[PDB]
């Protein structure tokens, strides 16, 4: 539910940029059948940036509806204003989601004390489990281990998705927090290393198109079978890298279309269509993963 | 003017975090009296991050009404979704603002082609002059000179504000753009250097509390009296640095309160009150500048 392979699922769109219910349904059936532990609905990969809060809620509600209890859903709920973050959380109260993935404020670059108050205030006004999300390359702000240790003492802050790719953070955080605080990778290419060092899972972009391998790899990692997991990781590694050859979620939406998982690879501005060179590189990485 | 000393004005708030009309009015009178060339309303320093679009529009129109034709007002109109950027801009069509300051999409990290499509689309849905704003440390995105060269050929994209502090960019950009394309520094500490290199002015955080000196320094620069402009700059240098000792606009808001320009130093979460140590740092820089 908060461990293993968690997908950061795309928000499939028609050619007009509106959510495509039929494509979303295919994806959810795909994850239920493939053994994905949970779905993150409307995070970065789900184009949270270019959906308004109303569309955002509709997509999360649609996802719960289609999931029909077969797989846990986590809603993305971050905002760079504490009052908006709180307010967005309230829309999901008593909805069926099992928790929230909430990002560090982007753009306004708060202090560590500001991060602590941001996340503490969010956790206060919900009964829902909160997972902190740290991705400094996008936000301009880095949530430090010391601060995670402070926040972990809050009852319903249950874990962190760490996307720096800085693997020393695993044990710096682990020393400061209780044994049931969940550490998740937010970086596909370093996620197996992350789990090998003590991590419990990954919120994965690769899982959109290689769900079964990711789930097996995460299960082997959790059992301590790292060599066996590493074999699968090597065949996924080109995907781990090339899904980011052009801005995420551009390559992965195109890959979902190439596999037939979604009807179109349409995105919203300022995301733009994949280049021909991009297609060639992604295609080669899909073939290396044995998916084409 | 899109030249000289432009203030990135704080949005003064009451203890509730709502805009304080009397403080705003005072700040605007102060800039009219001090020779400030124009006001940027609700940019970063004016806490665009924690105002919703309606509050944002209210502050811009309030600012414009209080300016009462005495000084040009530039609206901050940045958004990381192109549709939302278009919609915020449209609020100010036929308003009386003289132009828009529009930041590169933050968080979602579009490609250079994405930035080109984003800004081109914004420019197409307005008659207002557009100044591009580059601040990679906040956005996760870097608008490169070449892309600025492309954008400079859209009729109503008329300048760039450059906050990297990478002084090389002045002449890389100048070489690819028209001689009437406006180049503004977005980094107080390097702004005189930026102007000595061929830059046309500064969108300043320092100008909030030292408007007279900043106005004078940019005038001397424009006349080529750099030795003299530098005397003022050395006086202001501790401010150019220490106004960022804690996250902007925490220290500048505190400085405004201390100088008696605003009633309250309140900000919206995740910005937090200046620390005791921060006050003392800021007080000292204000003394060095001769304002305290
Ligand atoms: K949004
Ligand atoms: K809202
Ligand atoms: K509270
Ligand atoms: K806890
Ligand atoms: K905002
Ligand atoms: K132009």
Swiss-Prot record, chains A, B:
Q: In which pathway does it act?
A: Amino-acid biosynthesis; L-lysine biosynthesis via DAP pathway; (S)-tetrahydrodipicolinate from L-aspartate: step 3/4
Q: What is this protein called?
A: 4-hydroxy-tetrahydrodipicolinate synthase
Chief location: cytoplasm
Against NCBIfam families, the record matches this protein to: dapA
Record has Cytoplasm as a keyword? yes
Q: Which GO terms describe its cellular component?
A: cytosol
Which InterPro entries does UniProt cross-reference here?
A: Aldolase_TIM, DapA, DapA-like, Schiff_base-form_aldolases_AS, Schiff_base-form_aldolases_CS
Molecular function via GO: 4-hydroxy-tetrahydrodipicolinate synthase activity; identical protein binding
- Specify the effect of residue 197 to Y/D: 1.4 to 2.5% of wild-type activity. Decrease in affinity for pyruvate, but nearly no change in that for (S)-ASA. Exists as a dimer in solution
Recorded consequence of changing residue 138 to A/H: Strongly increased KM for L-aspartate 4-semialdehyde. No effect on KM for pyruvate. Reduced activity by 99.7%
Q: Where in the cell is it found?
A: Cytoplasm
Q: How does it assemble?
A: Homotetramer; dimer of dimers.
EC number(s)?
4.3.3.7
Q: Which Pfam families match?
A: DHDPS (PF00701)
UniProt enzyme class: lyase
According to UniProt, residues marked as the site described as Part of a proton relay during catalysis are 44, 107
